[PDB]
Amino acid sequence: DIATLSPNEQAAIDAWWRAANYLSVGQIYLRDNPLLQEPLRPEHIKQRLLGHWGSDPGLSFVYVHLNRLIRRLDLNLIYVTGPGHGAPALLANAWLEGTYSEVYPNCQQSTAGLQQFFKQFSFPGGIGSHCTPETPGSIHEGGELGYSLSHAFGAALDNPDLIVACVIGDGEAETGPLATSWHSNKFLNPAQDGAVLPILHLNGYKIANPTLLSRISHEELRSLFIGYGYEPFFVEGNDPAILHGVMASTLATCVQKIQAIQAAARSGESSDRPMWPMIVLRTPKGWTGPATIKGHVVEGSWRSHQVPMADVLTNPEHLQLLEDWLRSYRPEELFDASGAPVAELQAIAPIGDRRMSANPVTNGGLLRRALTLPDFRDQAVSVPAPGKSRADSTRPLGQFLREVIRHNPDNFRLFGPDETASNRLDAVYEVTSKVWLGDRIPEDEDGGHLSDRGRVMEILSEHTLEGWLEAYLLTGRHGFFATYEAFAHVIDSMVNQHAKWLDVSKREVDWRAPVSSLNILLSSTVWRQDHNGFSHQDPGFIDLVTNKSARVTRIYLPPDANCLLSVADHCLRSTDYINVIVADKQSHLQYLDAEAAARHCAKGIGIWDWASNDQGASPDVVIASCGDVVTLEALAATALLREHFPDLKIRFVNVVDLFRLQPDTEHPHGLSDRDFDSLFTVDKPIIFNFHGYPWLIHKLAYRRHNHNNLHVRGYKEVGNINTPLELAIRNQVDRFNLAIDVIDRVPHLRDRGAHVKEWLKDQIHDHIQYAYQEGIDRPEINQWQWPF
Amino acid sequence: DIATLSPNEQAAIDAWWRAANYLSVGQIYLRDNPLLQEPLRPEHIKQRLLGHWGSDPGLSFVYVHLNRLIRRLDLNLIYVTGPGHGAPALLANAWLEGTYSEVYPNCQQSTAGLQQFFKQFSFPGGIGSHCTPETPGSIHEGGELGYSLSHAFGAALDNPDLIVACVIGDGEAETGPLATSWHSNKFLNPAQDGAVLPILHLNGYKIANPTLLSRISHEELRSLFIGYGYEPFFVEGNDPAILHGVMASTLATCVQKIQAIQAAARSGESSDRPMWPMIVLRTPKGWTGPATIKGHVVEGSWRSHQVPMADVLTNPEHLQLLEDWLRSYRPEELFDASGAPVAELQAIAPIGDRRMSANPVTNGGLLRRALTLPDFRDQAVSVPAPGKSRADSTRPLGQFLREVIRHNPDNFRLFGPDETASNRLDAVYEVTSKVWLGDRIPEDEDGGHLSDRGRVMEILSEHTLEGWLEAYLLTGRHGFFATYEAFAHVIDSMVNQHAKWLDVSKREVDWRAPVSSLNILLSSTVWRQDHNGFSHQDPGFIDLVTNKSARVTRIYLPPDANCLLSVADHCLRSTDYINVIVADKQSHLQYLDAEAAARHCAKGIGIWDWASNDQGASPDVVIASCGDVVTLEALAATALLREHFPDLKIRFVNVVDLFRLQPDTEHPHGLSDRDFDSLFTVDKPIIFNFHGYPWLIHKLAYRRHNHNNLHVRGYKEVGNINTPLELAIRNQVDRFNLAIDVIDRVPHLRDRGAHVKEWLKDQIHDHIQYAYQEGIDRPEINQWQWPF
Ligand SMILES: Nc1ncnc2c1ncn2[C@@H]1O[C@H](COP(=O)(O)OP(=O)(O)NP(=O)(O)O)[C@@H](O)[C@H]1O
Ligand SMILES: Nc1ncnc2c1ncn2[C@@H]1O[C@H](COP(=O)(O)OP(=O)(O)NP(=O)(O)O)[C@@H](O)[C@H]1O
Ligand SMILES: Cc1ncc(C[n+]2csc(CCOP(=O)(O)OP(=O)(O)O)c2C)c(N)n1
Ligand SMILES: Cc1ncc(C[n+]2csc(CCOP(=O)(O)OP(=O)(O)O)c2C)c(N)n1
Ligand SMILES: [Mg+2]
Ligand SMILES: [Mg+2]
């Protein structure tokens, strides 16, 4: 009798829904007099209304019916809200369950608690209008639309007993990222992962337009979700007396199908991909709000999206409508004299960690277990002599990540947009494979690396991969994201959203435990351009990330393979950060052995003694590099200057942790003035070679005592199909251009360096001509090794 | 008999396809000996192979069959290529048609022309590996995937006789932007617009993984495209002798259905949304290439994506396979002794502007007609006294765009993500409406503003709107894009792609005519936060645009409504630029009348005489602003300083064209040192108030003679739910913080300004406290007017 809804049971469910709707309206409008004991006066009304109403009745309607199944079936549910502007609905249900009073004791169940609960919403010094980290039971705010469903599937990974109910706005379903994320059911393994129950809140409008999903035919809407791989169930209507029974029947059927799917998969019976149930809920927008305002239809219209009436403070006619709207929920029957919800409502609230707002999954940092990291020195390459041996930079990292996967079989995942093979991380395929629940063919057995239980997620949507990983981290797990630097601008908005979530959680919300870091590896750079990737690719993603402070993000540019291992090992232990690691995958010179790499990465920035020439003396010039390809040209420029100017003293500095250039006043992570002046002197020229836009170095280190001697050479522009040396010449980061820059900058080389400067320009001409004749660089350039 | 393919006609079509495939392989591999007259030696082979092979046979297969219908039905087709890495297929077919020889006379039809044609591809000093602007008949490079389909619909707008054939790679179909762009058929009016014939190139793989669209069941794939609103036709096979007739039949059926749809709609017989035909083409990847390499399957596998053999240069065995691969196309039967294609191939080539590569639509700048712009002074607000009257800033712009739409009924469109009403541009609804082909209800007659022939495009996907507009401009039309600044990070990648296209077209490609500018209006700013928009919204899009230099991008921050009209009028006449206009929509003070606004916008930056105090004297301080909200605080700070320091002389400077801060050496648009020193003195402090990150002003004007006196205040962090004055206080751009900044910077106020500085701090405390207890600012702040 789980499907059938008792008339006695329906009354309590309906009463809860009215109470949830009443509190939603109170949060938007009222700042005083929560229960209308006295007549509603304009001094009780908020000024500058900012909350949204249209989506709230639908969100609360789903919430109360999900609570019914939790009590009856002991389900482990969480609630992911697509329309984040419907935050007051989520807070209202959290308050009714008692979760909000536990987390925030100032908002008690009493009347005085309701004064604070209403006053705080969308108010200065209170809380926001979206599902911010302050919201209990929230892993995602719907401020930026299109990422809700990918977050739902990210939370369901490796959570076999968890069912994630994702409510999706119909306008949000028009966005790019959301349309693709429907296909995430081809990467969800029913045997080992949880289930996502997507609910399409098809209220027909978004802000001022009808939504295209609502205005297509019912047959097209059904065919669309069959094509996405779902089994759609439609709950449509406008009468709550009818929709309560329909919604209860539909949700019960969906949960039974979900549990039947998981039971079949976990017995080794139906290992093929199933058709997951989904619900299309078609209800009026502003369902229980005012019917008409100023003669225009408001309920079931786009006019109820923000507020049915925004001028209640000015004219008494709309103030009376607001009071009539509030009294239509009959609050006298819902709250007792003390202000607490009546015992009828208390009986149907779930208990403990079953409440969808006290669920520990939504505060995943509490469930987080540190990774069992193997010693990365086992994968370290052998560097007997710095700058003389060649090795693939990312191949040791793949072997290291292979051992992380082996030792963390359910805690760690690797995310990549069909570039794991391209990024030369194939070593992870020796222990695991790529998850694939779609159809398989015998041709995939050769080198496909596909299985239903792979630890590597592979889909071409950068939005979907980022959504999966962000929710995977926020639910207490660990991950690693590997992609090309060219396609990093695609996830600019998603990274900004996650950076805001981490920053608010760490500073403003005390009860949210720290989660694992978002580790992004940009495995192919803009200097060693390969077959894939557009021509004018730029390192603009580094600049965008740096806009956020060192408080929440870090940039690492390891110069070789052993430094990449140390950086990856350190970042797999950090918690509240967005770690961006830039490392090219081409065969490169190796500089530091395992022990030197660990020391160098711990310092973030240091002097390379083997490449330096100024031991026990003041250097004539400081040559600094940041980036593997950039570092090679700086070293080659150093070797050229040592051969032609034997008396020239050069100090070589390598920067790995880019944010250490900022002064320690701006952030504790940065170098102090004494430390900065010890590395880069107080008066000598600094020739800084940078992998990225040169202006960024200036932005970070303008408050230094020697900023007037900081010369930065970096990315400017990319012409089509430059050879690696030709591209460096165009941007003037080449060995020859750097040597020319040193000759210009060093005061005592401005006359004696003229003949060398002319010879360097001849070399630039010769190599450019050879690149046009052959399409490749000379063997001497490709096989260059550090002399001395 | 158009559907049936003659055996004689099939032979020529097959011969053309082999010739196209032969030239694709030659472009990837050969740099000499185009027709194998002598044995293939390793010196004929390119070094650093960069072209892609897997997608080429499918692209050429579609191309030759489209040419058949052009010759038979006289269709006006263009070819939009999703897999841009399959560029050598497009160039090969352009060469066979003779288009490439006309555009590039160095690559003639002869054997000598083939030496240059093969040598240039993916070569330094040649052409790129994607469909760059150098490619004839290309409006879109498939470097960044996901935008091909939205570009196809943008080209079809207002082009009733045009059919756009868009080939979509199955890997590309997994991306976010492409998944939602299928719904563009709900905005494409059959009576007035063209038709898009999407062809899904379902070769089963993308780079190293099977595509999810290929591995779902046929019933799911069919249901997916029915749900998208299409009528899918499946062309599946691997034998070309059989697939040639199937493809010819399917394309003929699709075109007849398209013309039947347009004929029914243009007679007023049925104005309902039709089911547009689409084609699913399932062919092996690397279709005619080597079957197996090193014992692994290559044809019909992901291993053929880049190159079946990447080692032909080293070992002779692979070199022999390459020659056997080339001879499998039988080039002795396809090219004449002189190297021209045989007369059999010449017969089936289209003639003139029907060739899909000589189609003038793809070089839309040739078809561009300048807009009939009305005089914007008719919409100008009345400003009898600067800084005293108030008006909505964007409403005059809406009335101006209303008249632009009226005078350009088929040449101009407005694009917005359901924010036209929010951005207060409702005036455009007085002449036109929003295009909507979905189901309509009588409730839409009140304020829906929906019709099948609206000039305003309204979908919630920012990716789709940007794709529509970019192709609309590249085909020679005009448009205006209005959105929120908060959601501008969504289109970062798309704007980067369009910036590359404009920059290469203007500089490197001589035959491409200039197209209209991409005019982006960010109608809601981060300083006036409203109901919509997430908590932590930042002006980072301005920074990303400025990475592209002044050659291709311009940033305008008009201070009031009349300046917005002048900026919008000027930008509707510019051609090869990305114009970003930042203008808040809230009710603001008005400063310049119609004539003064036109003069100020022409200069880009100037001294406001009415707000200045230093006439005939050296100013003590220069107060500069850039942005409407920022300008208000700068003026209020100026008024405060005038009241408390009657002897203080203040020069007020307003910046509208942001790039004029750059020196004229960097770009001719920038101010010279003489002009910059006349506005901002050579030795006085400059208090610069900026709408955006302060570091950007430093980046633009670091090399100025008075940069040591430039003190910039801008956006730092928006926090959550701050009142407008409170948000300015947090970022220290408020009137009180600016006045404090002036007191510190001016040398003779450092002692006499101490008591005023304490009073200013007391005001900051008072307004913050009032904002916490009321949620709104004081009426004195809200109703502030310029005194004097
Ligand atoms: N003080 C500064 N503030 C902001 N950006 C700067 C500054 N100095 C240089 N830049 C930017 O960084 C790049 C390189 O400048 P810089 O690091 O000074 O090298 P440089 O060789 O000294 N060139 P210049 O300073 O013009 O003689 C340029 O493209 C500038 O846009
Ligand atoms: N070369 C530069 N000089 C000054 N500021 C810079 C430079 N490059 C970037 N900036 C940025 O500009 C912002 C604004 O600083 P600024 O305009 O100098 O104001 P200010 O009052 O002078 N503060 P300060 O310069 O540190 O004493 C800083 O926070 C930096 O992030
Ligand atoms: C990409 C994007 N564009 C625009 C917005 C602005 N916005 C916020 S809420 C909203 C309405 C869409 O709501 P819908 O998904 O229809 O939800 P419902 O009202 O049915 O809950 C819009 C356009 C946004 N958040 N994200
Ligand atoms: C968003 C994005 N991610 C990654 C890439 C890298 N890339 C370039 S070509 C390509 C293959 C796409 O496969 P598909 O569209 O099926 O092409 P086809 O099989 O026809 O070659 C990929 C992933 C890209 N261009 N865009
Ligand atoms: Mg909606
Ligand atoms: Mg493919």
Residue numbers in the entry:
A (entry chain B), B (entry chain A): 9 to 796
Please quote the authors directly.
Phosphoketolase (XPK) belongs to the transketolase family, a member of thiamine pyrophosphate (TPP)-dependent enzyme superfamily. It converts F6P, xylulose-5-phosphate (Xu5P) or sedoheptulose-7-phosphate (S7P), which are intermediates in RuBP regeneration, to produce acetyl phosphate (AcP) and C3, C4 or C5 sugar phosphates. XPK is an enzyme present in many microorganisms, primarily involved in substrate-level phosphorylation to produce AcP.
